[PDB]
Design a protein around this nucleic acid. Structure first.
Lengths: 76, 92, 334, 89, 96, 108, 105, 93, 84, 99
DNA sequence: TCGAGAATCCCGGTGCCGAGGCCGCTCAATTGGTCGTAGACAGCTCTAGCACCGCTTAAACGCACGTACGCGCTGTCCCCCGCGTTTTAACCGCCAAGGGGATTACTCCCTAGTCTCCAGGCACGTGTCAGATATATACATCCGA
DNA sequence: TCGGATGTATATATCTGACACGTGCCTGGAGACTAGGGAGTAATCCCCTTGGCGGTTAAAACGCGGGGGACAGCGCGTACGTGCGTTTAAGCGGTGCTAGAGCTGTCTACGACCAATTGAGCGGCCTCGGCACCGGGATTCTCGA
């Protein structure tokens, strides 16, 4: 179970995801990949905003689902 | 100075096709397509904002306009693209 | 028989308002309870949703198909749990009937209950006979025609929406348009000996002894058990040009199989492909083919194995695989 | 959870455009003789035209955040396709 | 006993349904067909009493306008009866 | 006194100019108050349509063993796609010709 | 001194209402003073022509009340009106009475 | 609140072109939709003519040219004459 | 400055034959070369009238390549490749 | 010895050679003279942009080809193979140009 | 079922010109505030959309029958196509001239905006007569003989 | 050409519901004044259109032979029009329920607007290679036995 986080530059990354975890841990995992701060990550999938607090299975993110990641304009 | 979407249509081609060019006449057609489709959607949203007595062209009006003009699955794909884009825009 | 504009028969409207005397009246007269309306809800579904028990008891005792699929492939367990009936799901589990069922979304009934009691109670270990020939001879077609006109039947233009019986001259089923439309619709496939049996007795015979025990038989049992078609929630895209089987012939195959022809090549990294959220009923129970049901079909002539058959939720399967699917009435892995 | 509501839908109602109705539309068109295979073709063409017009009439309604397809957003759905309709606006 | 030769009543109905303006399709079956078609596009959509009328007043006026062209094609092939190929050709020429 | 000037096109990930689309939506008197997300949505729709047409034209050009896209390739790409042909049904792509097809009855 | 603009030009259609609809329709940033008096005169002529033809059709039909059928006859009987109103569908309008020469015995 | 239409004006035109002939209600709605449709055609073409010349106003010329473009043949020849006569009677008075 | 006349014959019979071959026509009747010229004159008049009145509204005397595209757009025949 | 193609095979190779090409099928100078003589009754002494007559021609060739693609289906509808002056009129009446 | 000849396509080599790139420049996109108002949202009211039931009744439907003609086959001819030879003007190159398209500067008159005043048309009734509805009568038309 | 059944047009009673007319009012249209800029007008540059002359050859024109298709005629079956009995939902009235259309009030977040800034796009030029063009050897149609 892995996803594809596509940054606005077009470069995508692969990272292990638990099928029943929440967004907080997988958002903090991006810090171990590119050093992105969790407070200002704002990942997007299927046109939704995917705010923290809810699990990933709520948005029905299956395997190899390409997500997005826009950063607030203060550090982009 | 005349304006054209040539700089952009080349960028979109380098995305859809890394090794592919476009002749002057094809850029002139693709620019006319982007201007014609832009005019179609803008006029639809204009007629769509006047039907509801509105005065603001919102993302919803453009979404309905591209749902009206574009046929078949093309509209369902363009709506998703516009949605993905505006979500990344307003989230920054 | 008599039906409503919504496909609701007499038993449907009798079980919706839960009128039990009418239910007994229509069940003791011989009405078939394993019937789906224009949506696909059976009397079991309606009864379970509205909260009625005696009608469910009579239906279970009158040999009604309990493992049925409703509008969005909703099993009766789904509605019975979605509407909070505990004794109802208890009575349903008293007969079993695939407690681990699945809707089009993929949500097993447990994902509906939102109730502790149900979550703890669930997890414990015919009409006109149309006879038309498929690739037969001249005198064979005349024989089928006279057998149809003596047995009160008709002769259609190689297919219609009311075809129930097809015939094969050989022992194995071919791969032409008509046999695919027969298998996907769940018709009876005969080895041309059934007409030979009827011409000796001048009456109808049993189709069980003259049916081939292969994929078509699985499709027949699928149609009889009211389960959905083969290619349900499977979206198919025809890439390039086809010469063996026309693109139009494949389109008709996908339409008859219940699948949607995608008009635009499904990009594996787009948002539309990943927002599908549908499963396939005939996908292998717990393999990597249920959550990813979207196929790009192509004739295996030049483009060989691209070393990647699945990229997310988009599959690249050859047309020979699509034909072998109808051969076996399954979704073979890749 | 779920909608907890059976969605009762209609099906095969294209047969409501019966054979005599198609004959009277033809007779009005000026047709003298009518082949038997054209009734299915006629009702299919009618279903296609309605799906092309109602789809625009529905999205004209979904935009206004309504749930009743009015008569003014149907003539608007017909004006877009060139089939302007006088009498309802 | 007394039987209008095949075609006499046909012309008698052509002269009748052309001078009249009443709707030739039954209203309730067309309303049910509209509700059956619109259910694919949005669930629980309601229709005004004038919406279905406006949706049929221009629907049969399109079918009548199609059958004029189907006649003009059946006559082009030196025929009297119209066939599915006539409607197919009319739609292909008209851009449908 | 001012942070980095990140253009709106790169903020939405799309390639077409959000600023130019916004300027043209305002200066074409389509309405009085053009929204902020409407130019982004319209630029995204235009970019998707352009990407589809260009992908089909490149696929048509690779079949002709050519890299540079010509109006003939655009005509072969639009007229071969059902949806794109419905969109451009009343459009003449200059120097595009027609689709190569002969009626099965005309052939011997 | 309340001489309306529709009475100055000698028209019967509203000049002020046409001006208001040109200003509200968002057709241009500015609207000339001679545009409403010109547009309200073309609409007053087109109406005075379609109604003239409809009244002629009603007189030839032994009636004194213009109905949608008479409007359809007036629109489809004139060559210029049939080209202008060629794509419109007049509700309750019917069809021009005509039969092909091949169908007549 | 309420709708606006050219019903009274169509009545006043009919009273001078056919003093003995009246009009129905469904036929009045059709005339109201017809006037509202030719308006959106001439004004819709006026927007385009103004933009094509980078103009910001809609003068009498940008309405005469739209009548000439949309109206077919003789109707256009007479419509521009009526419009010019109305403009002349309006500017002089 | 020059007065021109009878220039529709300039659309020669082999030109119409080439147009029909491109359209897919295999056999052409001898009377097509006179009806096609009439249809061509009708269409060219319909487009050129709109182009010329566009030019007259623009207060010009040179029919540009843009008002012709506009005239083709008015008739539902938008022409791509000449917008600039 | 005098190899003479059968009637009907040169037309097929002429269709195959003109459907894959994009060049203008009518000579430029006669079409230009036709356009200039048509635009003589509307406004006399009128100039034409070099890209205007080409745009007129680029649209006119496509129009006459789409008409010849529609009038050929009428010829096949009548169980024929040649197009007659009676089917162009039909294709133009169905399309809405002579009704 | 075979033999000579034409057209299509692939590979290799040459060369004019247009596509991609670079640089100077500028004006339009971006950002930052600031203020006005458009519409999102909550709330209330009313009506028309939906649903049902009862009764009648005219149209939809199935079936039997006759025949109109759609289609297939045959024969005739004629005219359109393929080809060779004569013709001719489209096209390319070059040169010249000037009419008007584009631009800029100046100005002024026309139209948006605002305040005020007023009466014309729309909602609401309300009286009334013209086309339908039925009844009776006469003329032209189709079918059979 | 004549006789009988019937569709169609025409004259008359009554009749009813939609059309023509009267009235309150309020909100949109008209007057008057002011301010700003969009467009009319004059002058200027050049460039892009028009016109002409000379040579070439490839498309156009014309004559001719032939065969393939357009068209007329005839036969056959079959499928569609037509009439009759049956049925089956369409349609109209009557009532009931309420979901949602429509209007009203708050307010707040979003978009117009102005000032300062800068960098991305646009025009000018600059170069080189994908593509057009030509020649040679090896696959497909096509005529013609």
């Amino acid at each position: 179970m892995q996803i594809f986080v596509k940054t606005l530059t077009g470069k995508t990354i692969t990272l292990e995801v638990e099928p029943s975890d929440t967004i907080e841990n997988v958002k903090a995992k991006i810090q171990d990949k590119e050093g992105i701060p969790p407070d200002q990550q704002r990942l997007i999938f299927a046109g939704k905003q995917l705010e923290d607090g809810r699990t990933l299975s709520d948005y029905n993110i299956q395997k190899e689902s390409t997500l997005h990641l826009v950063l607030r304009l203060r550090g982009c | 100075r005349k304006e054209s979407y040539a700089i952009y249509v080349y960028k979109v081609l380098k995305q859809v096709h890394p090794d592919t060019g476009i002749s002057s006449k094809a850029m002139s057609i693709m620019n006319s397509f982007v201007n014609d489709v832009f005019e179609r959607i803008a006029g639809e949203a204009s007629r769509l904002a006047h039907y509801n007595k509105r005065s603001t062209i919102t993302s919803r009006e453009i979404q309905t306009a591209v749902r009206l003009l574009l046929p078949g699955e093309l509209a369902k794909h363009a709506v998703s693209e516009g949605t993905k884009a505006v979500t990344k825009y307003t989230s920054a | 028989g008599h039906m409503n504009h919504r496909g609701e028969t007499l038993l449907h409207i009798a079980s919706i308002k839960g009128d039990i005397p009418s239910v007994e009246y229509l069940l003791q007269n011989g009405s078939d309870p394993n019937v789906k309306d224009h949506a696909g809800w059976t009397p079991l579904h309606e009864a379970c949703n509205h909260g009625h028990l005696k009608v469910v008891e009579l239906l279970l005792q009158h040999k009604a198909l309990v493992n049925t699929t409703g509008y969005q492939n909703d099993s009766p367990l789904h509605d019975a749990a979605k509407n909070g009936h505990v004794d109802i799901v208890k009575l349903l589990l008293s007969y079993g009937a695939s407690r681990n069922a699945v809707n089009i979304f993929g949500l097993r009934p447990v994902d509906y209950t939102d109730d502790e009691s149900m979550k703890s109670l669930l997890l414990l270990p015919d009409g006109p006979l149309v006879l038309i020939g498929s690739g037969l001879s001249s005198e064979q077609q005349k024989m089928l025609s006279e057998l149809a006109v003596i047995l009160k039947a008709k002769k259609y233009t190689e297919f219609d929406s009311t075809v129930t019986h097809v015939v094969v001259p050989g022992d194995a089923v071919q791969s032409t348009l008509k046999c695919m439309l027969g298998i996907l619709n769940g018709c009876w496939i005969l080895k041309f000996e059934w007409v030979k049996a009827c011409l000796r007795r001048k009456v109808c015979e049993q189709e069980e002894k003259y049916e081939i025990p292969e994929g078509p038989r699985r499709s027949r049992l699928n149609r009889e058990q009211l389960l959905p078609k083969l290619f349900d929630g499977c979206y198919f895209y025809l890439w390039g040009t086809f010469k063996h089987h026309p693109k139009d012939n494949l389109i008709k195959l996908v339409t008859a199989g219940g699948g949607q022809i995608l008009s635009r090549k499904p990009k594996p990294d787009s948002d539309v492909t990943q927002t599908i959220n549908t499963v396939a009923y005939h996908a292998r129970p717990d393999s990597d083919q249920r959550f990813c049901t979207q196929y790009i079909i192509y004739e295996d002539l030049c483009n060989y194995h691209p070393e990647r058959v699945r990229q997310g939720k988009v599959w690249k399967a050859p047309s020979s695989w699509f034909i072998d699917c109808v051969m076996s009435f399954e979704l073979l892995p890749l | 959870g779920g909608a907890k509501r059976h969605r009762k839908v209609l099906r095969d109602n294209i047969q409501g455009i019966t054979k005599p109705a198609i004959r009277r539309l033809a007779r009005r068109g000026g047709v003298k003789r009518i082949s038997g295979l054209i009734y299915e073709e006629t009702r299919g063409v009618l279903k296609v035209f309605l799906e092309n017009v109602i789809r625009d009439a529905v999205t004209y309604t979904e935009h206004a955040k309504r749930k009743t397809v009015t008569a003014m957003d149907v003539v608007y759905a017909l004006k877009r396709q060139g089939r302007t309709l006088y009498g309802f606006g | 006993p007394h039987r209008y030769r095949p075609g006499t009543v046909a012309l008698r109905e052509i002269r009748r349904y052309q001078k009249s303006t009443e709707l030739l399709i039954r209203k309730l079956p067309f309303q049910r067909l509209v509700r059956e078609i619109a259910q694919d596009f949005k669930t629980d959509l309601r229709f005004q009493s004038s919406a279905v009328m406006a949706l049929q007043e221009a629907s049969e006026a399109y079918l009548v306008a199609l059958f004029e062209d189907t006649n003009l094609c059946a006559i082009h092939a030196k025929r009297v009866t119209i066939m599915p190929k006539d409607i197919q050709l009319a739609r292909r020429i008209r851009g449908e | 006194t001012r942070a980095k000037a990140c253009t709106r096109s790169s903020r939405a990930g799309l390639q077409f100019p959000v600023g130019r689309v916004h300027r043209l939506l305002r200066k074409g008197n389509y309405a009085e108050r053009v929204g902020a997300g409407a130019p982004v949505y319209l630029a995204a729709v235009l970019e998707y349509l352009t990407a589809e047409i260009l992908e089909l034209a490149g696929n048509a050009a690779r079949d002709n063993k050519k890299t540079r896209i010509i109006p003939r390739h655009l005509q072969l790409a639009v007229r071969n796609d059902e949806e794109l042909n419905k969109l451009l049904g009343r459009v003449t792509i200059a120097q595009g010709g027609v689709l190569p097809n002969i009626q099965s009855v005309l052939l011997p």
